[PDB]
Amino acid sequence: KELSFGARAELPRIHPVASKLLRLMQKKETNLCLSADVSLARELLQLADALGPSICMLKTHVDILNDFTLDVMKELITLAKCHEFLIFEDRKFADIGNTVKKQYEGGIFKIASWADLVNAHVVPGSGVVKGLQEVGLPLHRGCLLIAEMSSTGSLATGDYTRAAVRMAEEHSEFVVGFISGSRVSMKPEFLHLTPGVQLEAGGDNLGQQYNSPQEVIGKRGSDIIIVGRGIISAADRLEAAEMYRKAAWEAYLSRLG
Amino acid sequence: KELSFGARAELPRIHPVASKLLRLMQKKETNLCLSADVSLARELLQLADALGPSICMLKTHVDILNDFTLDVMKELITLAKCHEFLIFEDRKFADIGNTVKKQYEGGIFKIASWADLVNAHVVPGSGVVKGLQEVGLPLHRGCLLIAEMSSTGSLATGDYTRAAVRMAEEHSEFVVGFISGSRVSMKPEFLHLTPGVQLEAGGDNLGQQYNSPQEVIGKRGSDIIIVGRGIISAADRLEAAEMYRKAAWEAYLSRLG
Ligand SMILES: *c1cc(=O)[nH]c(=O)n1[C@@H]1O[C@H](COP(=O)(O)O)[C@@H](O)[C@H]1O
Ligand SMILES: *c1cc(=O)[nH]c(=O)n1[C@@H]1O[C@H](COP(=O)(O)O)[C@@H](O)[C@H]1O
Numbered sequence: 001k002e003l004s005f006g007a008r009a010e011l012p013r014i015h016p017v018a019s020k021l022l023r024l025m026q027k028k029e030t031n032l033c034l035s036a037d038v039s040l041a042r043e044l045l046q047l048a049d050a051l052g053p054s055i056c057m058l059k060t061h062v063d064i065l066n067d068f069t070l071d072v073m074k075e076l077i078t079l080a081k082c083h084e085f086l087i088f089e090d091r092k093f094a095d096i097g098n099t100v101k102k103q104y105e106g107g108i109f110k111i112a113s114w115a116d117l118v119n120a121h122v123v124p125g126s127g128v129v130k131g132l133q134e135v136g137l138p139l140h141r142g143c144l145l146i147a148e149m150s151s152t153g154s155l156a157t158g159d160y161t162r163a164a165v166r167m168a169e170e171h172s173e174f175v176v177g178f179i180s181g182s183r184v185s186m187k188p189e190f191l192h193l194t195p196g197v198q199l200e201a202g203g204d205n206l207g208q209q210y211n212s213p214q215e216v217i218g219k220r221g222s223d224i225i226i227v228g229r230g231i232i233s234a235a236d237r238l239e240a241a242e243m244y245r246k247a248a249w250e251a252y253l254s255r256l257g
Numbered sequence: 258k259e260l261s262f263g264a265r266a267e268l269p270r271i272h273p274v275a276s277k278l279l280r281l282m283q284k285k286e287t288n289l290c291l292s293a294d295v296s297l298a299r300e301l302l303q304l305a306d307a308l309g310p311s312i313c314m315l316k317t318h319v320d321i322l323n324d325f326t327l328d329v330m331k332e333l334i335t336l337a338k339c340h341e342f343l344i345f346e347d348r349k350f351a352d353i354g355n356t357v358k359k360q361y362e363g364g365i366f367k368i369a370s371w372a373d374l375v376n377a378h379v380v381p382g383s384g385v386v387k388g389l390q391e392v393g394l395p396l397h398r399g400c401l402l403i404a405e406m407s408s409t410g411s412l413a414t415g416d417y418t419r420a421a422v423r424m425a426e427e428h429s430e431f432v433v434g435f436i437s438g439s440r441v442s443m444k445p446e447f448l449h450l451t452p453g454v455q456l457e458a459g460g461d462n463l464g465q466q467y468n469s470p471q472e473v474i475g476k477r478g479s480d481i482i483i484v485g486r487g488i489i490s491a492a493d494r495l496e497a498a499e500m501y502r503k504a505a506w507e508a509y510l511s512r513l514g
Pocket of ligand 2: 405453454465483
């Protein structure tokens with residue numbers, strides 16, 4: 001039956017990145033991942049600073065930052081360490097192994113130098129995980145596999161989802177869990193991170209679908225909610241982040257018994 | 258009955274980007290897309306200039322360029338216009354509509370500002386295309402959908418592939434074709450581009466698989482071969498590009514009549 005985050009952090013087969021994450025989740029009482037979908041470095045950093053105490057993780061799309069530099073990432077690393085959260089680059093790699101290795105290590109972004117976690121789609125087959133790990137393992141990084149998507153018409157279903165779970169099991173030295181809408185694996189060493197979350201049900205006008213923290217954490221058995229616009233679009237993002245943190249945490253407690 | 262590229266360029270439902278490409282393929286007698294997988298701007302520009310005459314298209318991975326600036330891309334466009342090839346950014350978009358829109362238009366890369374073509378995975382559902390098209394249509398761009406992949410263990414098969422074809426047909430305003438290992442649609446308005454191509458049998462150690470141009474174009478019915486390492490790793494890249502051009506071109510002619 002259901003183990004606490006602190007207990008999972010001590011599971012035998014647990015990745016040190018997952019263990020570090022589960023520990024600060026337990027310590028800070030948050031299972032909220034902020035999706036910091038903004039185009040300005042000054043806004044990203046002011047969000048990370050102010051909301052840092054409320055979150056276990058900050059999720060970035062650096063390819064959307066109009067003023068990206070590696071110095072912005074350095075300041076973000078300082079905030080992650082000071083407020084205690086992980087940095088997750090939402091790169092959604094979906095290319096052959098030979099290419100994703102360079103996209104993760106190199107270019108302008110040098111994602112691997114600053115991101116604790118990245119994610120990958122499984123559509124290319126396991127070579128995508130093998131390419132990323134050749135870079136990630138040396139650097140003690142973790143990866144999430146996209147077993148399910150939140151958007152209308154997603155093909156990440158059935159046999160596809162099963163393939164994701166299988167691939168994660170075969171590369172558990174590097175893969176720490178899933179992007180999914182539910183619990184897709186019974187193994188408690190794996191983390192389940194769920195995007196497509198807002199307090200009000202609904203969606204956007206480009207196929208995003210939203211479910212509540214209570215539905216996702218409490219009934220669907222996921223671990224962490226990933227929240228973008230639900231927080232970002234509020235006048236007071238701190239208040240918003242706290243609302244989401246409390247909903248996700250209490251749903252987690254109430255799942256625990 | 259198969260139409261020539263020049264005849265296809267004139268089909269009533271042809272996309273202007275597809276038309277421009279078909280015309281120059283006929284005019285230059287090339288159906289080779291160079292995959293310019295290099296890490297330096299001068300290397301990209303050098304290959305583009307030297308091999309421009311031999312190719313219909315130059316496929317880029319900007320996110321692997323150590324010294325990207327929009328100035329490099331201006332220089333690239335100059336070569337494209339001079340030697341007459343299309344620029345294809347192999348970004349392989351794989352996220353929700355709202356995000357991809359920003360990844361296509363914005364950030365440091367401003368992909369839509371310079372890429373005649375991009376491609377997208379269909380796994381997120383059709384919102385991925387709707388988001389891209391919001392930026393792509395005003396800028397007169399085209400998109401390819403990834404219907405099949407060249408790598409081992411690929412999940413882009415069966416109903417996934419059929420979903421890709423369906424999505425393309427329903428967004429023909431913007432979608433001009435497929436990344437696939439074979440012909441996936443009988444509609445001659447759609448282009449088929451095939452990566453995983455080398456003259457000799459084999460693969461790499463991260464799940465890539467190679468098939469020959471005669472196999473891919475002649476027997477499987479694709480239009481364009483995408484070749485990276487088979488050209489880039491050769492001592493004489495000009496002679497290597499010419500060998501692939503002549504192979505793909507003859508295979509096309511044989512299939513024709
Ligand atoms: C990625 C995968 C997925 O299945 N669903 C997603 O929404 N995403 C990314 O998560 C963020 C959600 O933001 P919001 O809808 O809460 O604003 C977003 O960054 C998207 O790229
Ligand atoms: C993308 C999709 C796919 O199914 N197969 C692919 O190989 N790619 C991309 O195409 C290029 C292949 O290069 P090479 O193996 O000929 O060197 C590469 O850029 C890869 O990202």
